[PDB]
């Protein structure tokens, strides 16, 4: 089971977001994000959620996290909505 | 000496709708340099599931590798390597499915390796298996490490990064070993 905040942002072309993976297997066997847009992770401290910072996005985007626990694989999406200046 | 090879290309979301292009565009190529009856192909997509685009029975048949995977859809979901694997080796690789049983079998996997799942691929062992490197995510300790997973012995013999098809002429002479 995942689960993914925000579920759908809007921002400026070129700006950035963070998302959060969160699982709820609390030590999945894996869990990340599946996107093609540039993304670095954050600090860790615990295993049930990481933290994408999604930077320069340029065109409207999707995101998607997944976890896989001991019930299942699971994914949740997540909008991107960017508008030009 | 008859080659059975199969192409497992990376369609989940993680590659960029032209970088999925290019690996299609990639594949033509080299069947397309390959018509000879010695190799025969198949290819299967691989994303949060998998599924077969021909068969060897199909190359067999139809043989034109333009109209052959001018049917594929961008399958846009997580990235199941693993078991894609495991796929091929016991769902492609088949009597039934067109696979000669004495052609040495070999696998070329594209993808950037950025898995979503884990396993062994002791299914495939005996399948030598070149795995070649797109994508913006394929840049990581974690990415790399996953395509030497997948990759045939040693390493840095059956890895590399796919450029604008430099390998056309470095993969394909020996890719002429094969052959015999
Ligand atoms: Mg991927």
């Given at each position: 089971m995942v689960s993914v905040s925000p579920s759908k942002v809007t921002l400026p072309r070129g700006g950035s977001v963070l998302v959060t993976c969160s699982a709820s297997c609390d030590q999945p066997k894996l869990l990340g994000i599946e996107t093609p847009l540039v993304k670095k992770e954050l600090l860790l401290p615990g295993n049930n959620r990481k933290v994408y910072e999604l930077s320069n996005?340029?065109?409207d985007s999707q995101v998607m996290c997944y976890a896989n626990c001991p019930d299942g694989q699971s994914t949740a999406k997540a909008f991107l909505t960017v508008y030009w200046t | 000496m008859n080659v059975d090879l199969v192409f497992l290309f990376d369609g989940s979301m993680s590659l960029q709708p032209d970088e999925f292009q290019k690996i299609l565009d990639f594949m033509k190529d080299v069947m397309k340099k390959l018509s000879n009856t010695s190799y025969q192909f198949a290819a299967v997509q691989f994303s949060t599931s998998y599924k077969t685009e021909f068969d060897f029975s199909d190359y067999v048949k139809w043989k034109d590798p333009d109209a052959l995977?001018?049917?594929?859809?961008?399958?846009?979901?997580?990235?199941?390597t693993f078991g894609a694997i495991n796929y091929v080796a016991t769902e492609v690789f088949r009597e039934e499915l067109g696979a000669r049983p004495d052609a040495t079998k070999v696998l070329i996997i594209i993808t950037?390796?950025?898995?979503?799942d884990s396993g062994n691929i002791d299914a495939a062992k005996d399948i030598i298996r070149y795995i070649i490197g797109i994508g913006?995510?394929?840049?990581?300790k974690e990415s790399q490490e996953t395509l030497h997973k997948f990759?045939?012995?040693?390493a840095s013999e059956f890895v590399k990064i796919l450029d604008?098809?430099?390998?056309?002429k470095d993969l394909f002479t020996e890719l002429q070993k094969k052959i015999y």
């Open positions: 996005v340029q065109e | 995977l001018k049917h594929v859809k961008h399958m846009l979901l997580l990235t199941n950037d390796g950025e898995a979503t913006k995510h394929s840049q990581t990759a045939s012995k040693p604008t098809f430099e390998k056309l």
